[PDB]
Structure formats: structure tokens, C-alpha cells
Design a protein around this motif. Structure first.
Motif, PDB file in Angstrom:
ATOM      1  N   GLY A 162      63.491  19.924  47.201  1.00  0.00           N
ATOM      2  CA  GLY A 162      62.911  20.993  46.832  1.00  0.00           C
ATOM      3  C   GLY A 162      61.757  21.551  47.718  1.00  0.00           C
ATOM      4  N   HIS A 185      66.941  26.162  45.306  1.00  0.00           N
ATOM      5  CA  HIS A 185      65.809  26.030  44.627  1.00  0.00           C
ATOM      6  C   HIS A 185      65.073  27.298  44.396  1.00  0.00           C
ATOM      7  CE1 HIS A 185      62.902  22.565  43.649  1.00  0.00           C
ATOM      8  NE2 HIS A 185      62.128  23.675  43.865  1.00  0.00           N
ATOM      9  N   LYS A 198      69.034  18.692  32.756  1.00  0.00           N
ATOM     10  CA  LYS A 198      68.495  19.324  33.932  1.00  0.00           C
ATOM     11  C   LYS A 198      67.948  20.854  33.715  1.00  0.00           C
ATOM     12  CE  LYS A 198      71.171  16.343  36.750  1.00  0.00           C
ATOM     13  NZ  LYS A 198      72.252  16.026  37.543  1.00  0.00           N
ATOM     14  N   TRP A 199      68.326  21.582  32.801  1.00  0.00           N
ATOM     15  CA  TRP A 199      68.079  22.821  32.713  1.00  0.00           C
ATOM     16  C   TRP A 199      66.990  23.112  31.440  1.00  0.00           C
ATOM     17  CZ3 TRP A 199      70.034  25.208  36.909  1.00  0.00           C
ATOM     18  CH2 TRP A 199      71.359  24.514  37.373  1.00  0.00           C
ATOM     19  N   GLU A 208      65.248  18.312  42.446  1.00  0.00           N
ATOM     20  CA  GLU A 208      65.173  19.723  42.376  1.00  0.00           C
ATOM     21  C   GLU A 208      63.918  20.681  41.560  1.00  0.00           C
ATOM     22  OE1 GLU A 208      66.263  22.532  39.733  1.00  0.00           O
ATOM     23  OE2 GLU A 208      66.450  24.067  41.499  1.00  0.00           O
ATOM     24  N   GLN A 209      63.105  19.514  41.048  1.00  0.00           N
ATOM     25  CA  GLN A 209      61.937  20.148  40.360  1.00  0.00           C
ATOM     26  C   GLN A 209      60.790  19.646  40.970  1.00  0.00           C
ATOM     27  OE1 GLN A 209      64.481  18.213  38.184  1.00  0.00           O
ATOM     28  NE2 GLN A 209      65.392  20.483  38.360  1.00  0.00           N
ATOM     29  N   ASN A 211      57.682  21.104  40.066  1.00  0.00           N
ATOM     30  CA  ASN A 211      56.486  21.549  38.948  1.00  0.00           C
ATOM     31  C   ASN A 211      56.673  20.283  38.125  1.00  0.00           C
ATOM     32  OD1 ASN A 211      59.299  22.507  38.605  1.00  0.00           O
ATOM     33  ND2 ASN A 211      58.557  23.018  36.614  1.00  0.00           N
ATOM     34  N   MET A 212      57.699  19.425  37.948  1.00  0.00           N
ATOM     35  CA  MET A 212      57.564  18.425  37.043  1.00  0.00           C
ATOM     36  C   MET A 212      57.500  16.928  37.454  1.00  0.00           C
ATOM     37  SD  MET A 212      60.720  20.226  34.556  1.00  0.00           S
ATOM     38  CE  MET A 212      60.306  21.444  33.531  1.00  0.00           C
ATOM     39  N   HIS A 230      52.816  18.452  34.291  1.00  0.00           N
ATOM     40  CA  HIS A 230      53.179  19.359  35.046  1.00  0.00           C
ATOM     41  C   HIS A 230      52.157  20.081  35.868  1.00  0.00           C
ATOM     42  CE1 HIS A 230      56.839  19.746  32.262  1.00  0.00           C
ATOM     43  NE2 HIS A 230      55.882  19.516  31.656  1.00  0.00           N
ATOM     44  N   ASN A 240      67.869  11.597  39.730  1.00  0.00           N
ATOM     45  CA  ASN A 240      66.994  12.505  39.627  1.00  0.00           C
ATOM     46  C   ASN A 240      65.530  12.197  40.175  1.00  0.00           C
ATOM     47  OD1 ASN A 240      68.331  14.444  37.780  1.00  0.00           O
ATOM     48  ND2 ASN A 240      67.883  12.758  36.338  1.00  0.00           N
TER      49      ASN A 240
END
Lengths: 86, 73, 186, 81, 95, 81, 74, 77
Positions: B20, C4, G23-24, H24-25, H27-28, H52, H70
Motif C-alpha cells: 500500500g 491502491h 475487506k470492503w 491494502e489498508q 489507514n486502518m 485509524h 491481511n
RNA sequence: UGACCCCUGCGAUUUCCCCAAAUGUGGGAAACUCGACUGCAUAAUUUGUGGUAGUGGGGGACUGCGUUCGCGCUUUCCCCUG
């Protein structure tokens, strides 16, 4: 598996997952579908954000390329192989 | 199950790229066939200029994109 | 663009606004549950098993194992030998099983309709002690080049005993493939 | 397994959708265990693009979204193996 | 696997009593089922066969999705072949 | 092994280009190659999606996270080809 | 606190209410029925939450593993 | 040579509040006291807190589990 | 393109018996040896089961901030396009 063996050395166009089109001489493959392209050129379709204009094509020469099968979507014959005869 | 030849980067300050758009920087101490690395003196290197050092951390090879050695090995 | 940095203008939504299934009483077609070359075989497999099982009850009521004219003498004295070569002469069977003790009577069974030798016989010793001496020694003997087994005849001794055709007996020379070794003997 | 049934649909016409929204309609000529299928005399339609007829196309299995088979296909008879 | 022998039937009992039994009873009773795929679209139809890969053989399916005012769009497919990787959620008829 | 893998192993020591799933393209001298496509390079030139570039000295990249690789055209004269 | 591997923990959650986030963003809370070697979850009396807020009631729901983000009880 | 498996086992015995990044995150993030782990890298926490960067709100979850795929980066305390 | 008729499929090597135009040409037996032929470790990080979703663009009317008046961001309705 003659479906793939019959196409060795032909000028095939590889379709990428991101929407690109890699046109090069299909040399060899493997079980994972990792291909070897000679004299490849990369095309990409860019959307027109200014006005109703023809799709913009940006060619890019690469030469010899090795594409990972996981990133390959499909592939078709753009044209016969480069004829060596006069 | 051949492991990667990362013996060169052992005990060297590296800068790794994550999935990311995240990046880290630390000294490598060990690896695994799955590229699971343990780096010490690691900095978070967030999107902003701020820096945060926590030290020993672990990274999963599934998220490692590229790793560059700032000390040229 | 990148996965992303892609601006999801319409990300994945739920399914709460998409429940439009059919009512309960509108049941599915009952006759739409079947398969070919899977049940007709089992159907035929069940009958052949049941048909024999039903045929078994009829035979037990008609024929009596204990009340057999061929069978004679004390049951604990009589002996049973099988896997015997068809060429074994009666004298050869006497002289080979007389080593363990005198034989009062010997009965070699034959095919009822074909008349061929069955391959097993009943040996009756004069003394009950003479038989037991053969139980351990006779088992594993080699007569006419073919190994033979020997066990006390249970047709009239063991409670709840019956032969192959009735589902009982011993030995698995014709059981599941690669499950019963031919070298091992009874 | 089930991919064996997919390899039995050679010479028949179907419509496959890709993970990128692309649709491809053509006749099947060969399929592999990885779900990769080769279609001859095929027509491709990329998203926001114009249809194009291709005489051949070898597609990978990972990028496949789903297939659309004919209406007269014998499922009960074709799923026996 | 825990049973490396080639005669292992772990997959058999799994579909009969495991989480994948939702599809077995659907094909058994021929009940409809709604599937949410990675296309942001929902597919409502019946099932005829499947395997460990979560690949179902559907028939009489109805695709549904929405674009953008938000406008709904739906169509019908009498026979199709759905992949497993692209699936997100599955929901049988709650009746 | 695979023929594409052999073409990669023999390409060791020469200048090759590598693109990753995150869009970055790395062009530099190749140091080490492996059957699993793990490639080590030196003095590479990276190109980001925006277009900016940077300078590196010694870099290693995972193979699974590579989109494709560019090798010298002279490798076409290999005995296998 | 003795070490508790992830597999026994999920096994104990069976039959009890559990909430799972995807995931969303979307989440699903329901009675855990069973799981497989790949963590393909099957719930009962499930309720769908959208962006944290309740969206509606679904019922029995089968969800693959590679799509869920995490899991939590209650 | 310390490996991730041995290091993860150490953090477990220490019961330290390990923070974890999402795939893929950016912010979290999640933080909690690890209780166990399998070869699949799945981690279970006793008291998890979802934080967050933008909101800075710590949502209490309790005893939970997290998928290994994850996971993106581990951080101590 | 192709009916009818033949093998249910091995490239290489080893031993026994037999037909024989008898050192060759063949048949009836196995033996354990390579291939990347298949099944499972293969849907649990490195290709063969997804965080690459496809979720738009443009022509007219219709807001505001900055402005180099070309534009970046931002708020609306009707249309062509996929």
C-alpha cells in the motif's frame, strides 16, 4: 497440447490484466504461461478528459520481454511471423 | 522450496517497499524461504515527513514489493 | 491506475436490498432428484443381497446340518481337512492322517450333480485324544505338493456356525483383493 | 474434480466474462486444468471499446469471471463424470 | 493434507457436513441461491453441481447490479458457469 | 525447469528491466537469478507511476510481485531458441 | 494465559454469535455454524451491517475465506 | 539467527501489545495481546483495538482472530 | 474431409521360452530404471482459485474557491456513448 505448440514463433499480441497490449514474437512458453516476446511494443488506452477526441495511443518499444503468466490475460495472433524470404 | 539468496543483505541497512505505497527502513537480521524478514532499528516512514522508530519488527513476504540496500551491501 | 490509488466511486455494497426469493409454499419439483448409473446399480446390489438372505432362511428350515446321513460318529472326535488335491487317493489320505492316530471312518465329499471331488474330507479317529494331536500337527501339512489345512469340524460343534453359502466359514482366499494373503494358512 | 467437464465443451459456442468486464463470444477448441481456454473464430469486446473478431485467442484461467453456456446443454448427462 | 494417501475421502465428508454443504442441499432440493461476486453484481439462480473450488453450475440465473441517480440493471441467463475466486458471499433462500 | 526460467538464469550479470505489480519499473544490471523469478540487481533506475525517478545502489525484488521483465535482445541466439 | 492457537479459538466460536468484517467495509453478524480447513465460514441468522450500521437481515450465509478481513465475537 | 517464528513466540510469551497493519489498508491498524499463531500466520488477540490514523478512534473488539494474509507489518507496543 | 478394418498407448535398456526366409525380421512373460502423463503436498505468502473489480467518458444548461482566464478542485438537470 498442440494448441500452444502450433503457435511457437508467431507474432502474438498478449493482453495484460491492466488493459495493456504487448505485441511481440511469441518465442516460448511454459506450464505457468510465462512467455518470451521479441521486439515487443506496449500500447495502452487513455481516456480523453479534455473533449470528445480519438483514443490516445502511446507506443513504446521494449525488444525482448519476459511476461509472467499470472499477469497475462489472453493472447491472439496479430499476424504471421516475420518472413525471412525476399 | 529453495530460499532466497539474501545473505548479502544480512546485517545491512535496507529500505523496503510495501504493497500500500508504504515504506520502511531497518537493518536485516534474518530471512525465510517465504521472504519473512526481521529488521531492527526500523522506522515507520509514513506519508508525512514525521519519523517514528520502534526497533525490531517483522514483515510478511506477501506484502514486500522491493527492497533496496542503502549501504550498497 | 494502481489498485491502491484507484478511486472506488461505487465499492462493493451489501445484499440487503436484493432479497427477492420465492415463497416457501412454492416448493421445488419433487421428481427432480435422481441420477443415472448410480442408483440402479445400488438397487440391483441390494436385491441380490436380500434375495440370498431370504433364500438363506428357507434352506435352514428345510435342511438340518446335525441330521446329516453322511455325518457320523462323535463330533469332537471327527476331523475336517480341506484344500486337498483332487488326485489324492483314499489310501493316501488314510496313510497320511493315520500317523496321528487310527481312523475309524473317513468321508470324502463329492459334487452332488457333477460328481467331481470337492477337495475336503472328514476324518474320524478312534479316540478323541488322537484327533487333537492332529489339530496342531496336521495344519500346514503338504499332501501331493499342495499345502493343506486342518481344523476341528465346527459344523456340529460350534454354536451359530455355518458355511460360506450361509455367510460363515473361514479363510479369505476370495475376499477383497490384496486383503488376504495366500501364504498364510488356517 | 470439475475442470474435466470444461474440457468437454470443445467446438461449442459460449460467452465468457473476464474480471475486467471484458466479454468474449466464440467457439471453444481446447481447455486445460488451469481453466485456460482457447477459442477460435472469436469476438472480443473490451470495456468501453469496440468489438473485434479474432480468429483465435488463448485466455488464462485466473482472469476469467464466469461463462455462459448454451440453453440445450445436457447437464445431468454431462456431470456423470 | 492430513491424509496423504490417494484413497483419502476428506473432500467427501467436507461437502456433506462442512460449510460447503449449503450447495449440496441446494442441488439436492433444487433450491435457489443468491451469490455476491467481485463484479459488485448479485446472481440469483439454481445450482446443479460444484466441487471444492466453489465453482457452481447455474441455470435460470438473473443478474442484477446498479450503476451511478442510482439505476438498477438486470438480465437473465438460463445456463452459465460461475467461478469461485470471484465469489464474495452466498445466500440460500431464507424460507 | 522451464525454458523461460533458463532464459532468465543465463541472463544473469547483464542489464535487464523489471516491472512490479505496483507499477514501478527497474532497469539495471542483474546480479542473481532464481527459479522462482527472484532477481537481484545493482545500480538500477526506478520509474514510479507518476513519472518521478530515483537512485539506488543495491536492490532485490521478489519474483511473484513482478509484472514482466525485459532482457537483452541478443539472448534470442541461445541454443534452445 | 496458555497459548491458544487460532484453529481451536475459531472452533470454540462455533454455535455462538460472531461478527465478521470484510475487506470492503461490510460486516456480517450471525450464529457461526461451521468452518473448513480454509476458514470458509457459514453463519446462521446472519445480519448484514453496512459501513458499521445495520443494513438488514439475511439468514443463513456462506462466505469464502479470501474475502473476509477479520472476525470477532458478539 | 533469530527468525520470525521464534520472535513471534517471544512476543506471545511476553504478552506485549503487538500492533499489526492491514493488507491494502494504510489507514486502518489493529493492536492487541497475541495469544497464539499457526503456520498460516493467522494471529489471535485477547483485547483488540481498531485504530485509524484519520479518525484516531480505538474501537474495542475483545477476543478476536485475524487472517495472516491481511497482515502487513508487525510493531511492538 | 473421410466409412470400414486394426492397438487400447510408450520413447530406451535387461532376462526366459517359442515362430522363423534361423546372428536379422516377430510373438508370449515380467524387471526395476528417465521423461515434467496424471492424483494428492496444489485454493494457505512465489504463477494452476484474485485486494489487477468493470464501478466511466463527452455535448448543452447549471454553483463556489484559487487563477496565468488555458485551467485544478468542487455542486446540479437532460442527452450521445460502453
Amino acid at each position: 497440447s498442440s494448441k500452444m505448440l502450433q503457435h511457437i514463433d508467431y507474432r502474438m499480441r498478449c493482453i495484460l490484466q491492466d488493459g495493456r497490449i504487448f505485441i511481440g514474437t511469441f518465442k516460448a512458453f511454459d506450464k505457468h504461461m510465462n512467455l518470451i516476446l521479441c521486439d515487443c511494443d506496449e500500447f495502452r488506452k487513455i481516456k480523453p478528459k479534455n473533449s470528445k477526441q480519438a483514443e490516445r495511443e502511446e507506443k513504446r518499444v521494449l525488444g525482448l520481454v519476459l511476461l509472467r503468466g499470472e499477469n497475462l490475460v489472453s493472447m491472439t495472433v496479430e499476424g504471421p511471423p516475420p518472413k525471412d524470404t525476399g | 522450496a529453495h530460499p532466497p539468496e539474501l545473505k548479502k543483505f544480512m546485517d545491512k541497512k535496507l529500505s523496503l517497499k510495501l504493497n500500500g505505497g508504504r515504506h520502511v527502513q531497518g537493518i536485516l537480521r534474518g530471512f525465510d524461504p517465504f521472504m519473512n524478514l526481521v529488521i531492527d532499528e526500523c522506522v515507520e516512514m509514513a506519508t508525512s515527513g514525521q519519523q517514528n522508530n520502534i526497533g525490531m519488527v517483522v514483515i510478511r513476504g506477501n506484502s514486500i514489493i522491493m527492497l533496496e540496500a542503502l549501504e550498497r551491501v | 491506475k494502481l489498485p491502491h490509488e484507484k478511486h472506488h466511486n461505487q465499492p462493493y455494497c451489501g445484499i440487503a436490498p436484493y432479497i427477492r426469493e420465492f415463497e416457501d409454499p412454492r416448493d421445488a419439483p419433487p421428481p427432480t432428484r435422481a441420477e443415472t448409473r448410480e442408483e440402479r446399480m445400488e438397487r440391483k446390489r441390494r436385491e441380490k443381497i436380500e434375495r440370498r438372505q431370504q433364500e438363506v432362511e428357507t434352506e435352514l428350515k428345510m435342511w438340518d446340518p446335525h441330521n446329516d446321513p453322511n455325518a457320523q460318529g462323535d463330533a469332537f472326535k471327527t476331523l475336517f481337512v480341506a484344500r486337498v488335491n483332487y488326485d489324492t487317493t483314499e489310501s493316501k489320505l488314510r496313510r497320511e492322517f493315520e500317523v496321528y492316530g487310527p481312523i475309524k471312518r473317513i468321508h470324502m465329499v463329492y459334487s452332488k450333480r457333477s460328481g467331481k471331488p470337492r477337495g475336503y474330507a472328514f476324518i474320524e479317529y478312534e479316540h478323541e485324544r488322537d484327533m487333537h494331536s492332529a489339530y496342531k500337527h496336521a495344519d500346514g501339512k503338504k499332501i501331493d505338493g499342495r499345502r493343506v489345512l486342518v481344523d476341528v469340524e465346527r459344523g456340529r460343534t460350534v454354536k451359530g456356525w455355518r458355511p460360506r453359502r450361509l455367510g460363515g466359514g473361514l479363510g479369505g482366499t476370495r475376499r477383497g483383493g490384496a486383503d488376504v494373503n495366500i501364504r498364510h494358512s488356517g | 474434480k470439475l475442470v474435466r467437464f470444461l474440457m468437454k465443451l470443445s467446438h461449442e459456442t459460449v460467452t465468457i466474462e473476464l474480471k475486467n468486464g471484458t466479454q468474449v463470444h466464440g467457439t471453444i477448441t481446447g481447455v486445460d486444468v488451469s481453466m485456460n481456454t482457447h477459442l477460435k473464430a472469436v469476438k472480443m469486446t473490451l470495456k468501453n471499446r469496440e468489438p473485434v473478431q479474432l480468429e483465435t485467442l488463448s485466455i488464462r484461467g485466473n482472469n476469467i469471471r464466469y461463462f455462459i453456456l448454451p440453453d440445450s446443454l445436457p447437464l445431468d448427462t454431462l456431470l456423470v463424470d | 493434507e492430513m491424509t496423504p494417501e490417494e484413497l483419502q475421502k476428506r473432500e467427501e465428508e467436507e461437502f456433506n457436513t462442512g460449510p460447503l454443504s449449503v450447495l449440496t442441499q441446494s442441488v439436492k432440493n433444487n433450491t435457489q441461491v443468491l451469490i455476491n461476486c467481485r463484479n459488485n453484481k448479485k446472481l440469483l439462480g439454481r445450482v446443479k453441481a460444484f466441487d471444492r473450488h466453489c465453482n457452481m453450475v447455474l441455470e435460470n440465473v438473473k443478474e442484477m447490479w446498479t450503476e451511478v441517480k442510482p439505476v438498477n440493471k438486470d438480465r437473465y441467463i438460463s445456463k452459465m458457469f460461475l467461478r469461485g475466486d470471484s465469489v464474495i458471499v452466498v445466500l440460500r433462500n431464507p424460507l | 525447469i522451464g525454458v523461460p526460467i533458463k532464459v532468465l538464469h543465463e541472463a544473469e550479470g547483464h542489464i535487464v528491466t523489471c516491472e512490479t505489480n505496483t507499477g514501478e519499473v527497474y532497469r539495471g544490471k542483474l546480479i542473481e537469478a532464481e527459479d522462482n523469478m527472484n532477481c537481484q540487481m545493482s545500480n538500477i533506475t526506478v520509474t514510479y507511476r507518476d513519472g518521478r525517478v530515483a537512485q539506488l545502489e543495491q536492490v532485490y525484488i521478489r519474483g511473484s510481485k513482478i509484472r514482466f521483465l525485459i532482457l537483452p535482445d541478443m539472448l534470442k541466439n541461445a541454443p534452445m531458441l | 494465559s496458555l497459548p491458544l492457537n487460532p484453529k481451536p479459538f475459531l472452533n470454540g466460536l462455533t454455535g455462538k454469535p460472531v461478527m465478521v468484517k470484510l475487506k470492503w467495509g461490510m460486516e456480517y453478524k450471525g450464529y457461526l455454524v461451521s468452518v473448513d480447513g480454509y476458514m470458509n465460514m457459514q453463519l446462521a441468522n446472519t445480519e448484514e451491517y453496512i459501513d458499521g450500521a445495520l443494513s438488514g437481515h439475511l439468514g443463513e450465509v456462506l462466505i469464502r475465506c479470501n474475502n473476509v478481513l477479520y472476525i470477532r465475537g458478539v | 539467527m533469530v527468525q520470525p517464528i521464534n520472535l513471534i513466540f517471544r512476543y506471545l510469551q511476553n504478552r506485549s501489545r503487538i500492533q499489526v497493519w492491514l493488507y491494502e489498508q494504510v489507514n486502518m491498524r489493529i493492536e492487541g495481546c497475541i495469544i497464539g499463531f499457526d503456520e498460516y500466520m493467522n494471529l489471535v488477540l485477547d483485547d483488540a483495538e481498531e485504530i485509524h490514523s484519520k479518525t484516531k478512534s480505538r474501537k474495542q473488539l475483545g477476543r478476536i482472530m485475524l487472517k495472516g494474509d491481511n497482515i502487513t507489518l508487525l510493531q511492538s507496543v
